[PDB]
Write a protein that binds this ligand. Structure first.
Ligand SMILES: [Mg+2]
Ligand SMILES: [Mg+2]
Ligand SMILES: [Zn+2]
Ligand SMILES: [Zn+2]
Ligand SMILES: [Zn+2]
Ligand SMILES: [Zn+2]
Lengths: 55, 243, 338, 98, 48, 17, 50, 49, 67, 101, 335
C-alpha cells in the first residue's frame, strides 16, 4: 500500500498546476551544495506526484 | 561575450548570466579565453553567444533570466500598491534605460485626483518603450504564489492576490512580476516570449532594461530584512506551545 | 582578526547580488579593511668543494654616478636597502654563482610582482654549518578593492562587488553611514538568525558602552538589547529609517542598521588575477606552462572540449586546441606514414 | 562522492555520443555513416525549439498573440464554418503534399 | 558582455591583420604602444 | 560666529583645477 | 617660487651599530649573537598619504 | 502563419552535434542527484536504487 | 595596532580621544558608556571605534629591537 | 569654450528637438537630481530623468522630452538658469540669517 | 498625505515630492522665484566654531541632498598628500604613518592655496601657492630620572608618544608672510600619530595640498554633514491618566509632555524626537497617534573637521552647486 499520511507536507503549488490543482507537496531538505550555499528542498505534488527541487 | 575594458581587477558579468555558469560572486574564479582567428571568433560569437543561448538545449526552457534582487525589485514595482507620479515614472524609465531611450508616456491609470501610473505600466514601458519598438507581447502566466479567485467560475486573473499575469499588446493587465514570469525554467516567461517572437536582441534588450532598472531602483526604494521579520507574534508562541 | 563594520542590510546599487558586498569608499580611505602582506625570500651563500662560494656584491652605476635602474634599491652591500621600494624587475639580493662551481655568473634575486613591495627587514645571519644566510622580508600594503573576499562569522562570505562614495551611501538621522551593505537575500535561505541577533546585540552594546556576549546556548538576551535600543531612542528591532544618499528621500522600508563583525579573508584578487598571451612552454610537450608563477596557461579540459563540440564550433576547437596551444609543422612522407 | 562518480558518467555518455550528428537528409548517423535514427526522436524536431510541453507550438498563446496582433474592432467576424474554410484553405495543400 | 580588466586587456591580444579598412586604426594602436590600453604589444611584418 | 567670511574672501579654492 | 624634493648593521638582541668590513665576520662584536639586521636606508622614501 | 513558421523553425538543423547535446542533457542533471537514495520519511516502500 | 585617526564611517576624529578615554577609565573611574559619552562620541560608529579598539602597539613595543 | 563638457547624443534625439539626451561629463547624482527636479517643474517638460550609465565613468546622460512648444535644449537651459536662481535665493537667505542671528 | 512623510509600523509612505506641474489637472507648483523666494526659510538653531544646526524650510529633497553631497564630497580642503620619510625607525610602517598623517586635519583655510596642476613635472609642480610643508622630527630617549616603578611610558621615556601637534609648519617663500598670522596647525593636536620606545626616531616632512572629499576622505572637511526631516507627531484622540505616561515613555524624555489639570498627553518638542516607532507597537495608541515627517523641512547638522566653520562649508556647498549650474549653462552643447 502506502503510508504517505505520515510524510511532512507543505503549501507549495506544483509546476503542473494547470493539469492538477495541487496546493500541497511532500518535502525533505538536504544540503547537497557546499556549506556556503543554502539547503536544497525536494518536492512531490500530492495531486500528481511530480517531483521537483526548488533549492 | 563581448569584451568591455574596465579599470578594476575582476571579470565582471551581468547577474542574469550567472545561472548557466553556476556562479555566485563568493570568490568564484572564471577562465576567459580570447580566440585568435577570424573563423574561430565568428563561430564563438555566433554559436556560443549569450544572446543565442538563452535557452538550455536539454529542455528548451529559458536559463538566462532575472536573479534574486532583480526578481524582488520587479515584484516590488509591479506590486498593486505601487503608484508613481510623472516625475518618479520618468526617473524610473531613465534608470531603466541609460537616459538614451525615447519613452512614449501612456495615459495614467489614475486620472483623478492625481495623475498616477502603476508599476505594471512601468513594466509595460520596459517591454515596449515606444511605438517604434516592435515588441508586442501577449502572455498568460501563473505566478508561483497564486491563490485562486473567490469562485470556481471566475477567470484566473481574478485571483485574490496578483497571482495571474495577463499581458495584451505588451500591456501588463494583471499579476506581479514574479520568478515564474521573469526567472528561468518557465516557457511562459516574458523574456522567453520576447525571444521566441522577436529575436535574441529584443529579449536581451528587455533583460538589460530590467537589470538596470532594478539595480538603480532597489537601493532608492529600500528593502531590508531584520529580527522583526523572523520574530513570532505573541499569540503564535501560545498557539505553538499548546499544539 | 576583523573589524566592526557599520552594516546596512539592504538591496543597493545592484552590485550586491549573490553574496556580493557593497563597500564604502571613504571607509576604505580611513583604513577599514586595510591589511598588508609580508613575504620572505631566503638565500644561502653555499660554499663548494673548490674553496669557492657565492658572494653578494653588486650595485653598478651609470656614467652619471647613479646606479642602474635594476639596482635602484640595492645598497653597496648588494642586499636590498631596508625601507626602499622594489618594483617588478629590480633586484633586492644580488647573488652571483661561480662559473666553475674566480669568475662569478650573475644569479640575482629579482622581484616579480604586479604591485611594488617595500623591503622592511633584511636579516643577515649564518646557519648552523658556517654557511651564510640571507633573509629579506617584503612588505606590501593592500587596499581593499573589487573582488576581495569578506566574511561575517556566520558563513556569509562574498567579494566586494562595488566600492561607492560615502555621499551615495544611505544615511540615518545622525549621518551615520554604513561601511558595508549586505544583501537581505542572504538571510532567508541560509537562515542565519544569529547574524541578526549579533547586529542587534552589537548595536545595543556600542550604545551601552559594553561588549556583548553571543555564547552558544546563552549570551545577551534579545529583550535586554531591545530595551537598550529603545532607551537610547532607536527602534527595538534595530531597523532605523535611512535616507537615500543619491535621491535624499526617505527609504520606503526601514533598514536593519548596526555593527557586524566582518573578517577580511586571505583570498585577494591581486594574487588571483592571472593572464597569459604567450610565454614559457613545457620542453617535452611544447605546451604552455602550468603555474601562475611560471606564466602558465589555463587548461581547456575534456569537459570544455565536450562543450565546444556540443556547440558545433569546429574552427574554435581547432584554434583553441591546436593553433593556440601546440601547432607543429611536421614533415610526413606520402609513401610511408612516417 | 557524487562529484567524481558522476563526472566520469557524463564523460562516458559523451564518448558514446561524441560523433552523432544530424545529417542533411534528416538522419542521425555515426561517424561511420551508419544510421542510428532515421529521424531525430521520430519527429525531426529540435528540443531547443519547442514552445509547448515538448511540442513545437503553444497553440493557446499563439492564438492569443495572433488575435491581439491582428485585432481591429472594425472587422467582420467569420461564421463558424468560414473559419474552417480558411483553415482548410491554408492547411490541406500542405496536407496533400505528404 | 563581460567586463575585462585593462590590466589583462593589455596582455590578452588579438592578432589583427592590416587591411585597407583598418590601417589607420592599427597605426594609432601601434603609436599608442604596449603601455596605453588602446594600443598594441607586437607587430609582425608581412615578409618577416 | 554669526559673521560672514565668504563676502570678504575670494574663493580661490572653488575654481576648477 | 617653487619647491624641490624635500653600511650600518644592527644586532638583533644587543641593538649595536655594526660596520661589517670586507669579508670579516657575521657575528656581533659586542656579544655572540649570530643574527644581524640591516638598518634603515639613509635616502628618501616617498609615500602617498592615502 | 505563426504556427507553421514555428513548426518549420522547430526542425532539427543538419550538422547539429545532437549526440553531444543529448550526452550533456542526460549528464548535467546526473551531477545534481545523490548517489545515496533519499526518500520521504514515512513511505516505507521497497529500497529500489 | 594604534587607535585610528578617524572613525571609519563618519570620519570624525577619534584618534585624539584614546588617551582621554583611558584616563577617564583609570583616573576618576567611569563606566565605558559614560566615558564615551563624555568625550563627545554620540554616534555608535564613533563609539565602536573606541570601544572595540585593541591597542596592540603597546604589545609590539615590548619587542623593540633598537633599545 | 569647453566643448567636451555637455554633448547632445544624436542617436537619442528626435526631429525638431523636443526630445534629447545630453551627456554631461564630471557630473553625478548631485547635479543630476537637482536638475531633474527643476526641469520637471517646467510646465512644458513631459519627461525628465538622468542615469549614470556606469559607476566607473564620470558621466551623466539626462533625458529631456517636451511637448511641441519648446525644445529639450531650451528646457535644459531654463532648468539650469532656474537652479541658478534657486541657489541665489538660498545664498541670500542663509547670509541674511547668519548676519542677523 | 500631502507633504507629510507617513511613518508606519512596517513602511514609510509619501517619500516623493509631488510638487511639479503634471502631478494633477491643476498644473500648479510650476517653478518661479518670488514664490520659492517667499516660501523658503532658514532657521539657525545653533552656531559654534565646529558645529552648526540650521533648518532649511520649504526646499526640495533633491536640492537639500545636493547641498549635503557637496559638503561631504565636493568642498575642497587641505590635507597631507605626500609624506617624505627621512627616517622611520618606529614600529609603525611608513605607509601606515603616512595614512595617519594624511587623516590628520590641518587648520589651514582654503582659498589661500591654489589647486595643484598635475600636467607639470614634479620639480615644478609644488609651489608656495600650491603646497603646505609640515615637518615631524621626534626622537625617543629613555628618561634617566624615571620614578621608581613608573610603568607609564610618559615618565619612563621622553617623547614616547607622537602627536599631531608634533607636526610643525615649514613656511615656504610667501607662506612666511601669508601664513604669518595663521601658521598651519593640526585642527586636532592630541591625535596619537605614533608611539615610540628608546632608540626609535621619526623624521619626515609632508606636502599638504588642496583636495576633494570625493577623491579621498582625508580631504572631506566635515566630520559629518547630514540632515533629517522634522518629525511630526499628531495625537488624534486624547490620551490621559496613565496611558498618557505609557505614551510619554514611547518617546525620548523631552519630546511629549504631560499637561497639568488637563492630564492629557501633548507634543512638547517634536524636534527632540528620534523616529523609533516605539508607540506604533502597542495596539492601544494605534488609533490615537499618527507619526509623520515634514518632507520639505530639513534639520541640517554640519560638524566641521576643523579647517573651516560649518557655515562657511554650507555656503561653499551652495556656491558649488550654483557654480556648476552656471558652468553647464555657459558650456556650448556639442552634437
Ligand atoms: Mg559558493
Ligand atoms: Mg561560488
Ligand atoms: Zn501537481
Ligand atoms: Zn618515405
Ligand atoms: Zn650583539
Ligand atoms: Zn564615527
Amino acid at each position: 500500500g502506502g503510508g504517505w499520511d505520515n510524510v511532512d507536507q507543505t503549501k507549495t503549488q506544483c509546476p503542473n498546476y494547470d493539469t492538477c490543482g495541487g496546493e500541497s507537496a511532500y518535502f525533505f531538505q538536504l544540503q547537497i551544495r557546499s556549506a556556503d550555499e543554502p539547503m536544497t528542498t525536494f518536492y512531490k505534488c500530492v495531486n500528481c506526484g511530480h517531483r521537483w527541487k526548488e533549492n | 561575450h563581448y569584451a568591455k575594458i574596465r579599470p578594476w581587477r575582476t571579470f565582471r558579468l551581468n547577474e542574469c548570466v550567472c545561472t548557466p555558469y553556476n556562479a555566485d560572486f563568493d570568490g568564484d574564479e572564471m577562465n576567459l579565453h580570447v580566440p585568435q582567428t577570424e573563423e574561430a571568433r565568428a563561430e564563438a560569437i555566433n554559436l556560443m553567444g549569450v544572446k543565442n543561448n538563452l535557452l538550455t538545449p536539454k529542455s528548451g526552457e529559458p536559463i538566462i533570466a532575472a536573479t534574486q534582487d532583480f526578481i524582488t525589485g520587479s515584484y516590488l514595482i509591479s506590486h498593486k500598491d505601487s503608484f508613481y507620479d510623472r516625475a518618479t515614472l520618468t526617473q524610473l524609465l531613465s534608470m531603466m534605460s541609460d537616459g538614451i531611450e525615447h519613452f512614449d508616456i501612456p495615459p495614467p491609470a489614475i486620472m483623478k485626483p492625481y495623475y498616477l501610473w502603476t508599476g505594471k505600466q512601468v513594466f509595460s514601458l520596459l517591454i515596449k518603450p515606444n511605438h517604434n519598438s516592435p515588441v508586442v507581447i501577449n502572455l498568460d502566466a501563473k505566478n508561483k504564489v497564486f491563490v485562486p479567485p473567490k469562485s470556481k467560475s471566475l477567470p484566473n486573473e481574478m485571483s485574490q492576490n496578483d497571482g495571474f499575469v495577463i499581458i495584451r499588446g505588451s500591456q501588463i493587465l494583471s499579476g506581479v512580476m514574479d520568478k515564474s514570469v521573469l526567472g528561468d525554467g518557465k516557457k511562459h516567461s516574458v523574456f522567453y516570449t520576447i525571444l521566441r517572437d522577436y529575436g535574441p536582441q529584443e529579449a536581451a534588450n528587455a533583460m538589460n532594461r530590467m537589470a538596470k532598472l532594478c539595480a538603480r531602483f532597489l537601493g532608492n526604494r529600500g528593502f531590508s530584512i531584520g529580527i522583526n521579520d523572523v520574530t513570532p507574534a505573541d499569540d503564535l508562541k501560545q498557539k505553538k506551545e499548546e499544539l | 582578526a576583523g573589524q566592526n563594520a557599520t552594516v546596512a542590510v539592504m538591496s543597493y546599487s545592484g552590485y550586491d547580488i549573490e553574496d556580493a558586498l557593497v563597500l564604502n569608499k571613504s571607509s576604505i580611505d580611513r583604513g577599514f579593511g586595510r591589511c598588508e602582506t609580508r613575504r620572505k625570500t631566503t638565500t644561502v651563500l653555499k660554499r663548494y668543494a673548490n674553496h669557492t662560494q657565492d658572494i653578494i656584491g653588486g650595485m653598478r652605476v651609470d656614467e652619471n654616478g647613479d646606479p642602474i635602474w635594476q639596482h635602484q634599491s640595492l645598497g653597496p652591500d648588494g642586499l636590498g636597502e631596508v625601507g626602499m621600494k622594489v618594483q617588478s624587475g629590480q633586484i633586492y639580493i644580488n647573488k652571483s654563482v661561480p662559473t666553475n662551481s674566480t669568475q662569478y655568473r650573475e644569479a640575482p634575486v629579482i622581484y616579480r610582482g604586479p604591485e611594488p613591495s617595500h623591503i622592511d627587514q633584511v636579516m643577515m645571519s649564518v646557519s648552523d654549518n658556517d654557511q651564510a644566510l640571507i633573509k629579506v622580508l617584503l612588505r606590501q600594503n593592500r587596499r581593499p578593492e573589487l573582488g576581495d573576499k569578506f566574511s561575517s562569522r556566520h558563513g556569509q562570505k562574498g567579494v566586494c562587488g562595488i566600492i561607492v562614495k560615502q555621499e551615495d551611501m544611505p544615511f540615518n538621522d545622525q549621518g551615520i553611514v554604513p561601511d558595508i551593505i549586505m544583501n537581505p537575500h542572504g538571510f532567508p535561505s541560509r537562515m542565519t538568525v544569529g547574524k541578526m541577533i549579533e547586529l542587534i546585540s552589537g548595536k545595543a552594546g556600542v550604545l551601552n558602552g559594553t561588549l556583548e556576549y553571543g555564547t552558544c546556548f546563552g549570551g545577551s538576551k534579545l529583550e535586554d538589547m531591545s530595551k537598550i535600543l529603545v532607551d537610547q531612542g532607536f527602534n527595538y528591532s534595530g531597523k532605523d529609517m535611512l535616507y537615500s544618499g543619491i535621491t535624499g528621500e526617505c527609504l520606503q522600508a526601514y533598514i536593519f542598521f548596526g555593527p557586524i563583525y566582518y573578517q577580511k579573508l586571505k583570498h585577494m584578487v591581486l594574487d588571483k588575477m592571472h593572464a597569459r598571451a604567450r610565454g614559457p612552454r613545457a620542453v617535452l610537450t611544447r605546451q604552455p606552462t602550468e603555474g601562475r608563477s611560471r606564466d602558465g596557461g589555463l587548461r581547456l579540459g575534456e569537459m570544455e572540449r565536450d562543450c565546444v563540440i556540443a556547440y558545433g564550433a569546429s574552427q574554435l576547437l581547432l584554434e583553441r586546441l591546436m593553433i593556440s596551444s601546440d601547432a607543429f609543422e611536421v614533415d610526413v612522407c606520402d609513401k610511408c606514414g612516417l | 562522492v557524487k562529484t567524481a562518480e558522476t563526472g566520469y558518467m557524463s564523460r562516458r555518455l559523451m564518448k558514446s555520443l561524441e560523433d552523432l550528428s544530424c545529417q542533411y537528409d534528416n538522419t542521425v548517423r555515426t561517424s561511420a555513416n551508419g544510421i542510428v535514427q532515421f529521424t531525430y526522436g521520430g519527429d525531426g524536431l529540435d528540443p531547443l525549439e519547442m514552445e509547448g510541453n515538448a511540442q513545437p507550438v503553444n497553440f493557446n498563446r499563439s492564438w492569443d498573440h495572433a488575435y491581439n496582433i491582428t485585432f481591429n474592432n472594425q472587422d467582420k467576424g467569420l461564421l463558424p464554418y468560414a473559419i474552417m474554410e480558411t483553415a482548410n484553405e491554408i492547411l490541406g495543400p500542405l496536407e496533400e503534399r505528404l | 558582455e563581460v567586463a575585462v580588466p585593462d590590466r589583462v586587456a593589455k596582455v590578452l591580444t588579438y592578432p589583427e591583420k592590416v587591411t585597407r579598412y583598418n590601417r589607420h586604426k592599427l597605426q594609432e594602436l601601434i603609436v599608442n604602444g604596449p603601455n596605453v590600453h588602446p594600443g598594441a604589444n607586437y607587430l609582425l611584418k608581412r615578409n618577416e | 560666529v554669526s559673521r560672514d567670511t565668504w563676502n570678504t574672501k575670494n574663493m580661490r579654492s572653488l575654481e576648477p583645477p | 617660487x617653487x619647491x624641490x624634493x624635500x653600511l650600518k648593521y644592527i644586532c638583533a638582541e644587543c641593538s649595536s651599530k655594526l660596520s661589517l668590513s670586507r669579508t670579516d665576520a657575521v657575528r656581533c662584536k659586542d656579544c655572540g649573537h649570530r643574527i644581524l639586521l640591516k638598518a634603515r636606508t639613509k635616502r628618501l622614501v616617498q609615500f602617498e598619504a592615502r | 502563419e505563426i504556427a507553421l513558421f514555428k513548426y518549420r523553425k522547430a526542425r532539427l538543423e543538419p550538422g547539429t552535434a545532437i549526440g553531444a547535446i543529448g550526452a550533456q542533457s542526460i549528464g548535467e542533471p546526473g551531477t545534481q542527484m545523490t548517489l545515496k537514495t533519499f526518500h520521504f520519511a514515512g513511505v516505507a516502500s521497497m529500497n529500489v536504487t | 595596532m594604534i587607535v585610528p585617526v578617524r572613525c571609519f564611517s563618519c570620519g570624525k576624529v577619534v584618534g585624539d580621544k584614546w588617551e582621554s578615554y583611558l584616563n577617564l577609565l583609570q583616573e576618576d573611574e567611569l563606566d565605558e558608556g559614560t566615558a564615551l559619552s563624555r568625550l563627545g562620541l554620540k554616534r555608535y560608529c564613533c563609539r565602536r571605534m573606541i570601544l572595540t579598539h585593541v591597542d596592540l602597539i603597546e604589545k609590539f613595543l615590548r619587542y623593540n629591537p633598537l633599545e | 569654450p569647453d566643448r567636451e563638457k555637455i554633448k547632445l547624443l544624436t542617436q537619442a534625439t528626435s526631429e525638431d528637438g523636443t526630445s534629447a539626451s545630453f551627456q554631461i561629463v564630471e557630473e553625478d547624482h548631485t547635479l543630476g537630481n537637482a536638475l531633474r527636479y527643476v526641469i520637471m517643474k517646467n510646465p512644458d517638460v513631459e519627461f525628465c530623468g538622468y542615469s549614470i550609465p556606469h559607476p566607473s565613468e564620470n558621466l551623466l546622460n539626462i533625458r529631456i522630452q517636451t511637448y511641441g512648444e519648446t525644445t529639450a535644449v531650451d528646457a535644459l537651459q531654463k532648468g539650469l538658469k532656474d537652479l541658478m536662481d534657486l541657489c541665489d535665493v538660498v545664498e541670500s537667505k542663509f547670509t541674511e540669517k547668519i548676519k542677523s542671528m | 498625505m500631502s507633504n507629510i512623510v507617513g511613518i508606519e509600523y512596517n513602511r514609510v509612505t509619501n517619500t516623493t515630492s509631488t510638487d511639479f506641474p503634471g502631478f494633477s489637472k491643476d498644473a500648479e507648483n510650476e517653478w518661479n522665484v518670488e514664490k520659492f523666494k517667499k516660501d523658503f526659510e532658514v532657521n539657525i538653531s545653533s552656531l559654534d566654531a565646529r558645529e552648526a544646526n540650521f533648518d532649511l524650510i520649504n526646499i526640495d529633497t533633491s536640492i537639500a541632498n545636493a547641498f549635503r553631497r557637496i559638503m561631504i564630497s565636493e568642498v575642497p580642503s587641505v590635507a597631507a598628500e605626500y609624506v617624505y620619510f627621512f627616517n622611520n625607525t618606529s614600529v609603525i610602517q611608513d605607509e601606515v604613518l603616512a595614512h595617519r598623517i594624511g587623516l590628520v586635519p590641518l587648520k589651514v583655510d582654503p582659498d589661500m592655496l591654489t589647486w595643484v596642476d598635475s600636467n607639470l613635472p614634479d620639480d615644478e609642480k609644488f609651489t608656495d601657492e600650491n603646497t603646505i610643508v609640515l615637518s615631524l622630527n621626534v626622537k625617543c630617549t629613555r628618561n634617566p630620572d624615571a620614578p621608581k616603578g613608573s610603568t607609564d611610558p610618559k615618565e619612563l621615556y621622553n617623547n614616547a608618544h607622537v602627536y599631531a601637534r608634533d607636526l610643525k609648519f615649514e613656511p615656504q617663500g610667501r607662506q612666511s608672510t601669508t601664513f604669518a598670522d595663521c601658521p598651519v596647525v593640526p585642527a586636532d593636536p592630541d591625535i596619537l600619530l605614533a608611539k615610540l620606545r628608546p632608540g626609535q626616531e621619526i623624521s619626515l616632512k609632508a606636502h599638504c595640498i588642496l583636495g576633494i572629499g570625493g577623491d579621498h576622505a582625508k580631504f572631506s572637511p566635515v566630520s559629518t554633514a547630514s540632515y533629517r526631516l522634522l518629525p511630526q507627531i499628531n495625537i488624534l484622540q486624547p490620551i490621559k491618566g496613565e496611558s498618557a505616561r505609557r505614551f510619554q515613555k514611547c518617546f525620548p524624555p523631552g519630546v511629549i509632555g504631560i499637561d497639568e489639570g488637563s492630564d492629557e498627553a501633548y507634543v512638547k518638542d517634536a524636534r527632540k524626537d528620534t523616529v523609533s516607532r516605539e508607540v506604533l507597537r502597542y495596539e492601544e495608541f494605534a488609533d490615537k497617534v499618527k507619526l509623520g515627517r515634514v518632507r520639505n523641512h530639513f534639520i541640517f547638522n554640519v560638524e566641521s573637521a576643523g579647517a573651516m566653520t560649518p557655515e562657511e562649508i554650507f555656503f561653499k556647498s551652495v556656491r558649488i552647486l550654483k557654480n556648476k549650474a552656471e558652468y553647464l549653462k555657459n558650456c556650448p552643447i556639442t552634437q
